[PDB]
């Protein structure tokens, strides 16, 4: 019967009681956990039956304590952090945590040597400083996350805490091995090698196991428990193998592994993501509870038996000096911290000074000092001072950080947030009153008690002249910015934006609102999609790096065969190196003449592919293959003459060139993936700003009342939208394959999201049960996770594949053959004119490469690859509306008007080419009208487009050129021509939306009119 089970369960129950009883009180639950542990240790010192149950956990080994509790705490601190804002302010976090921890450890060591009466040397004092300077604030970061603004302050406190804890355990391990467990001597070179080993191979081993774990998690579908156990086993194996087998600081390895796993959360399924968040929070909570209970028991059993009044005096002075030292560290790093991103205000410096809550990490390190010291008093003094500092920091700093956050003015609720919460409470109260008025008129719920129902449903407020022209301009700018923020949140909620693009767009909107008269700036938004860096240069240089018998060897198999030769050469390289370093059957005849010249070098690379002259001349890879062959023949005649330098030259040269030639395209794929991530973020930010400008241009007529202010706001919005559109087109031009890959991924994601919504609508309507809909949801989730492992660079389709993928051409095959037979690829250079504004209609222009500019007269737009120009001019036989000028080198497919008229006249099935072309231009001409009608109703662009997609053009000859508008038709849009309405009360000249007062339509049949009508109905 293990007593540790009883102690662990009792600690869990004590922690649950402590959190359930001290939630309302401002003091933390860990302090009363320490108090309960002290009481339990007093009882164990009195009663031996309790001593038998507390002995196995109180007198635990230091090594198993570290190896069990440290990976959980370090990995949860790394996993809980928002890694985007952590990497955004990584410079400040890194310099503050690293250099402040170093100088705080030095100052605390000097204080421990000068103030304390014990004759401590520098090693034990530096151990004391490394234990004292490790900070674990969780209440402070929870308070900063909950109380409104300064989210950057919360994440800089969290990142500083994580790196401070990691490097503090590193410094503590260095000095613990300096003073306690060995006392060995070494040279300066071994010290340099040990510093290199720790500080470099910590994060390198963590990065290696993190990439292996990410590759393992990215290839697991429809299995959650495997992913959870892989995360847990990867954390524990990383820490154990790094700390024990590799003699490497495993704390930094778990820091790096947790930060990378938190960075690559898209390789984990979202249900597994939220389970992993809750699971690691639970594991760290259990670890903190066990550490604090164990610390209390051992403090009142062993660390309190040698304590005098001078120890308490030194504890008080140590607390005051620790707070002063941390404040002076932040104050002396304030110029350098202000000179880099986000700066540091004096209020944030005061919060970071006072938010240094000591935690379970320093308690565990003092525990292993106390257990490692043995019967010496240094461990008892260490654990007493650490327990006192933890208690004092927790109590005093928690209560005073609540009242200090109140006093400094960083906890005041903003006026727009308070007004939004008041509006939410008002709409909830209105909805509850309507629900109660519905419920009182029920049959079954008619004699229920309504006083109790109203008292239960009482959710309440948690927060309890040119000068006129300037004021109206400020009001209009503020209303426009609020509408832009609302539009960005609407885009994110509808499954269009990512989280990072949403955060960047609302950050730009807020910092535009804080200034005097500026709007959201395009130039500040350019840095999102500025893909320039070392990665385009790396991709360019690597694509410059790689650029009879031949027909035998082109079957992509002999390179795989020589890669098998690469690994089968690499293994005896290490074997011969190790055995000849440590120096049977003369190395078994030297691996039987290294596999008999390695099957005479795979029959001399199949006799240099039987002597391909040009291929072996023009390639340098074959040149150092020939260098390998002459070097290996030289080593063969060296073995005939028999040095080891020649053998090692053979091994080294073989392995290095073979691995370089293999690893070049994988490096190309990695660079393409990083460019893909940057391009996805930039495209999401740009597209979100564009559709936000479209929505804020739609809804601006209700808000803005003046005319000059509305004109200036429209001009500013149009200039910003045009600049972002041209920038995104040029960015697509710079990296074509990456842009095709990110557009393909976004298209697949949108299609699968709409399919998931269709499955939800099927299961909510009762036509599909829970099990079959869960099977279909599992199928679409497997497809989404395999979409996350897409190729990062899909090669761009040829112009024929773009010609067969047009919306009005895609279904048919004979029509595709006709268009491909009668198209014409025309090339244009920079600055030339494709068409002119006053010219007659001549044909369509499918853009297959490059960017154009439509200077319609004002009307400006930039079209890219995959846009057809001139459908309306071809169909309606009107003259051209816009002049198209090239912005880059543009290749277009020009189908002439005669060929398109012939193709329209021939193909007359039920989906006809005339019907498809008119439906495409009807969607294009009816989307802004429906957007104008339902602008204030909150309908987005994509919902309007998908609502319009269910519509269809009516055949007026089927209904004798008269159309009735019932309530069965959701919306009716006239596309071309004139019309008359109702009892011929007026004439409908416009292509605008039909008003709801029209009950009937009448069309005549004139020359050059051909009237069309696009109707959308509800679910019939």
SS3 sequence of 260-325: HHHHCCCCCCHHHHHHHHHHHHHHHHHHHHHHHHHHHHHHHHHHCCCCCHHHHHHHHHHHHHHHHH
Establish whether 559 is an annotated binding residue: no
Phi, psi (degrees; rounded to nearest 5) at 965: -110, 100
Task: Report DSSP letters for 371-398, one per residue.
Answer: HHHTTSHHHHHHHHHHHHHHHHIIIIIH
Residues 893, 846: Cα–Cα separation, whole Å: 5
**For the domain bounded by 3-407, which CATH number is listed?**
1.20.1530.20
Pairs from 537-545 (Cβ < 8 Å, separation ≥ 24):
538/667, 538/671, 539/668, 539/671, 539/672, 539/675, 542/664, 542/667, 542/668, 542/671, 543/668, 545/664
As to burial, measured by CB atoms within 10 angstroms (0-12 exposed, 13-18 middle, 19+ buried), residue 796 is middle
Q: Record the tokens describing residue 530, joined without a space.
A: 């500025």
Residues 778, 74: Cα–Cα separation, whole Å: 33
Exposure string of 924-939, with b = 16+ CB inside 10 Å and e = fewer, is: ebbbbbbbebbbeeeb
Q: Record the tokens describing residue 815, joined without a space.
A: 């029509």
Helix axes 522-529, 499-514, angle to 10 degrees: 160
- Best CA proximity match to 364, nearest among 97, 91, 73: 73
Q: Record the tokens describing residue 5, joined without a space.
A: 């089970």
Way the structure was solved: cryo-EM
Task: Give the bridge partners for 1001, in sequence order.
Answer: 963, 981
Residues 233, 209: Cα–Cα separation, whole Å: 11
The residues near 74 (Cβ < 8 Å, ≥ 6 apart) are 162, 165, 166, 239, 251, 254, 255, 258
Residues 4, 832: Cα–Cα separation, whole Å: 82
Residues 862, 728: Cα–Cα separation, whole Å: 10
Q: Which fold has domain 797-907?
A: Jelly Rolls (2.60.120)
Q: How many CB atoms lie within 10 A of CB 278?
A: 10
Residues 143, 922: Cα–Cα separation, whole Å: 54
Report the first-to-last Cα separation within the chain, whole angstroms: 70
- Best CA proximity match to 1011, nearest among 954, 968, 966: 954
Residues 128, 109: Cα–Cα separation, whole Å: 7
CB 847 within 8 A of CB 888: no
As to burial, measured by CB atoms within 10 angstroms (0-12 exposed, 13-18 middle, 19+ buried), residue 866 is middle
- Best CA proximity match to 1017, nearest among 964, 975, 978: 964
- Best CA proximity match to 863, nearest among 854, 871, 875, 876: 854
As to burial, measured by CB atoms within 10 angstroms (0-12 exposed, 13-18 middle, 19+ buried), residue 225 is exposed
CB 563 within 8 A of CB 662: yes
User: What pairing do the DSSP bridges indicate for beta strands 825-828 and 890-896?
Assistant: antiparallel
Cα dist from 894 to 809, 839, 843, 847, 900, whole Å = 15, 16, 6, 9, 10
Resolution of the structure in the document, Å: 3.4
CB 948 within 8 A of CB 930: yes
Look at residue 847 and give its three-state secondary structure: strand
Per 3-state DSSP, what percentage of the chain is helix, strand, and coil (rounded to 5)? Answer: 70, 5, 25
- Best CA proximity match to 379, nearest among 303, 490, 469: 303
Q: How far is CA 577 from its chain centroid?
A: 44
Task: Give the bridge partners for 890, in sequence order.
Answer: 828
Residues 287, 290: Cα–Cα separation, whole Å: 5
Largest CA distance in the chain: 113
Establish whether 348 is an annotated binding residue: no
Order of strands across the sheet with 969-976?
952-953, 1012-1017, 969-976
Task: Report DSSP letters for 100-111, one per residue.
Answer: HHHHHHHHHHHH
CB 852 within 8 A of CB 834: yes
Establish whether 873 is an annotated binding residue: yes
Phi, psi (degrees; rounded to nearest 5) at 844: -95, 155
Look at residue 230 and give its three-state secondary structure: helix
Exposure string of 823-847, with b = 16+ CB inside 10 Å and e = fewer, is: beeeebeeeeebbeeeeebebbbbb
Establish whether 870 is an annotated binding residue: yes
DSSP conformation class of 909: S
Residues 394, 360: Cα–Cα separation, whole Å: 11
CB 926 within 8 A of CB 975: yes
Look at residue 71 and give its three-state secondary structure: helix
**HEC per residue, 723-768:** HHHHHHHHHHHHCHHHHHHHHHHHHHHHHHHHHHHHHHHHHHCCCC
Establish whether 788 is an annotated binding residue: no
Helix axes 814-822, 897-906, angle to 10 degrees: 160
Task: Report DSSP letters for 675-711, one per residue.
Answer: HHHHHHHHHHHHHHHHHHHHHHHHTHHHH---SHHHH
**HEC per residue, 118-172:** CCCCHHHHHHHHHHHCCCCCCHHHHHHHHCCCCHHHHHHHHHHHHHHHHHHHHHH
Look at residue 974 and give its three-state secondary structure: strand
Establish whether 801 is an annotated binding residue: no
Look at residue 973 and give its three-state secondary structure: strand
Exposure string of 284-313, with b = 16+ CB inside 10 Å and e = fewer, is: bbbbbbbbbbbbbbbbbbbbbeebeeebee
Q: How many CB atoms lie within 10 A of CB 581?
A: 8
CB 892 within 8 A of CB 846: yes
Residue where the block lists tokens 């885009």: 491
CB 923 within 8 A of CB 949: yes
Residues 347, 408: Cα–Cα separation, whole Å: 7
DSSP conformation class of 191: H
Residues 255, 782: Cα–Cα separation, whole Å: 30
Residues 854, 872: Cα–Cα separation, whole Å: 15
The residues near 897 (Cβ < 8 Å, ≥ 6 apart) are 841, 842, 843, 874
DSSP conformation class of 967: S
**Helix or strand (DSSP H, E) at 962:** strand 962-964
């Amino acid at each position: 019967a293990p007593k540790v089970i009883v102690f662990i369960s009792g600690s869990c129950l004590f922690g649950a009681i402590s959190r359930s009883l001290f939630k309302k009180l401002p003091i933390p639950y860990t302090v009363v956990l320490l108090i309960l542990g002290a009481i339990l240790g007093v009882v164990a010192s009195n009663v031996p039956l309790v001593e038998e149950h507390t002995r196995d956990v109180a007198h635990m080994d230091p090594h198993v304590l570290l190896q069990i509790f440290l990976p959980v705490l370090i990995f949860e601190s790394a996993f809980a952090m928002d890694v985007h804002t952590f990497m955004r302010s990584f410079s400040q976090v890194c310099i503050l945590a690293l250099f402040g921890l170093v100088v705080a450890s030095v100052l605390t060591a000097v204080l421990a040597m000068n103030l304390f009466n014990y004759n401590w040397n520098f090693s034990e004092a530096m151990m004391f400083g490394a234990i004292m300077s490790a900070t674990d604030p969780v209440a402070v970061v929870a308070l900063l996350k909950d109380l409104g603004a300064s989210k950057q302050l919360g994440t800089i406190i969290e990142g500083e805490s994580l790196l401070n804890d990691g490097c503090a355990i590193v410094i503590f391990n260095v000095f613990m091995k300096m003073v306690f467990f060995p006392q060995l001597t070494s040279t300066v070179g071994q010290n340099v090698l040990y510093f290199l080993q720790v500080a470099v191979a910590g994060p390198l081993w963590g990065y290696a196991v993190a990439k292996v774990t990410v590759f393992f998690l990215s290839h697991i579908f429809n299995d959650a428990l495997v992913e959870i156990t892989i995360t847990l086993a990867a954390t524990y194996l990383t820490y154990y193998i790094g700390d024990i087998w590799l003699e490497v600081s495993g704390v930094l390895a778990v820091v790096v592994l947790g930060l990378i796993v938190n960075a690559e959360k898209t390789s984990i399924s979202p249900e597994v993501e939220v389970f992993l968040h809750r699971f690691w929070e639970m594991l760290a909570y259990l670890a903190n509870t066990l550490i604090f209970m164990m610390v209390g028991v051992v403090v009142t059993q062993k660390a309190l038996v040698a304590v005098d009044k001078m120890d308490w005096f030194y504890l008080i002075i140590l607390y005051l000096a620790i707070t002063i030292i941390r404040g002076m560290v932040i104050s002396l790093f304030s110029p350098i911290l202000s000179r880099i991103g986000y700066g540091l205000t004096w209020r944030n410096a005061v919060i970071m000074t006072w938010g240094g809550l000591r935690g379970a990490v320093g308690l565990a390190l003092a525990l292993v000092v106390e257990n490692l010291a043995g019967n010496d008093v240094i461990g008892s003094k260490f654990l007493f001072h650490t327990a006192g500092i933890v208690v004092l920091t927790l109590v005093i700093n928690a209560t005073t950080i609540q009242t200090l956050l109140r006093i400094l003015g960083m906890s005041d609720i903003s006026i727009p947030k308070r007004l939004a919460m008041a509006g939410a409470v008002r709409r909830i109260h209105e909805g509850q009153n309507r629900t109660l008025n519905m419920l009182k008129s029920d049959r079954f719920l008619a004699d229920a008690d309504w006083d109790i129902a109203t008292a239960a449903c009482e959710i309440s407020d948690p927060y309890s002249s040119p000068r006129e022209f300037a004021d109206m301009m400020e009001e209009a700018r503020l209303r426009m910015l609020k509408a832009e923020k609302i539009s960005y949140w609407k885009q994110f909620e509808h499954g269009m934006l990512a989280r990072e693009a949403l955060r960047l767009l609302v950050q730009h909107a807020e910092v535009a609102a804080d200034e005097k008269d500026q709007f959201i700036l395009v130039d500040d938004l350019k840095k999102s999609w500025q893909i320039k860096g070392i990665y385009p240069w790396l991709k360019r240089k690597l694509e410059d790096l790689i650029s009879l018998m031949y027909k035998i060897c082109h079957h992509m198999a002999f390179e795989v065969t020589i890669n098998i030769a690469i690994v089968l050469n690499i293994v005896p390289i290490i074997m011969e190196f190790v055995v000849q370093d440590k120096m049977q059957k003369i190395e078994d005849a030297l691996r039987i003449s290294n596999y008999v010249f390695f099957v005479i070098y795979a029959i001399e690379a199949i006799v240099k592919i039987l002597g391909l002259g040009r291929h072996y001349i023009v390639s340098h890879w074959n040149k150092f293959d020939a260098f390998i062959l002459v070097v290996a023949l030289v080593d063969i005649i060296i073995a005939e003459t028999l040095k080891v330098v020649k053998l090692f030259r053979l091994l080294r040269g073989l392995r290095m060139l073979r691995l370089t030639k293999a690893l070049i395209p994988k490096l190309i794929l990695v660079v393409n993936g990083k460019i893909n991530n940057q391009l996805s973020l930039g495209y999401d930010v740009g597209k979100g700003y564009i559709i936000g400008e479209e929505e804020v241009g739609k809804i601006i007529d209700r808000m803005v009342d003046n005319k000059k202010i509305l004109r200036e706001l429209k001009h500013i919005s149009e200039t910003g939208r045009l600049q972002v559109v041209k920038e995104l087109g040029l960015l697509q031009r710079e990296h074509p394959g990456i842009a095709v890959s990110v557009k393909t991924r976004q298209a697949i994601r949108t299609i699968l999201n709409h399919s998931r919504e269709t499955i939800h609508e099927l299961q909510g309507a009762g036509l599909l049960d829970e099990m079959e809909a869960h099977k279909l949801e599992l199928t679409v989730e497997i497809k989404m996770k395999r979409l996350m492992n897409a190729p990062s660079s899909i090669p761009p389709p040829p112009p024929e594949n773009l010609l067969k993928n047009v919306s009005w051409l895609a279904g048919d095959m004979k029509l595709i053959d006709f268009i491909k037979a009668r198209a014409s690829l025309l090339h244009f250079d920079y600055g030339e004119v494709i068409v002119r504004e006053g010219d007659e209609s001549d044909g369509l222009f499918l853009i297959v490469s490059g960017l154009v500019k439509l200077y319609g007269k004002v009307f400006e737009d930039y079209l890219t690859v995959g846009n057809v120009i001139g459908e309306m001019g071809v169909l309606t036989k009107k003259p051209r509306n816009a002049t198209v000028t090239c912005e880059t080198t543009v290749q277009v497919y020009f189908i002439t008007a005669e060929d398109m008229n012939i193709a329209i006249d021939t193909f007359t099935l039920y989906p006809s080419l005339e019907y498809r072309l008119w439906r495409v231009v009807a969607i294009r001409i009816a989307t802004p009208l429906i957007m104008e009608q339902m602008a204030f109703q909150g309908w987005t662009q994509e919902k309007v487009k998908l609502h319009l997609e269910r519509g269809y053009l009516v055949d007026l000859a089927e209904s004798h050129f008269q159309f009735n508008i019932d309530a069965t038709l959701e919306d009716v849009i006239l596309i071309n021509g004139t019309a008359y309405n109702a009892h011929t009360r007026e004439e409908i000249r416009s292509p605008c939306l039909i008003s709801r007062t029209v009950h009937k339509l009448t069309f005549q049949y004139t020359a050059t009119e051909e009237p069309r009508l696009f109707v959308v109905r509800n679910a019939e």
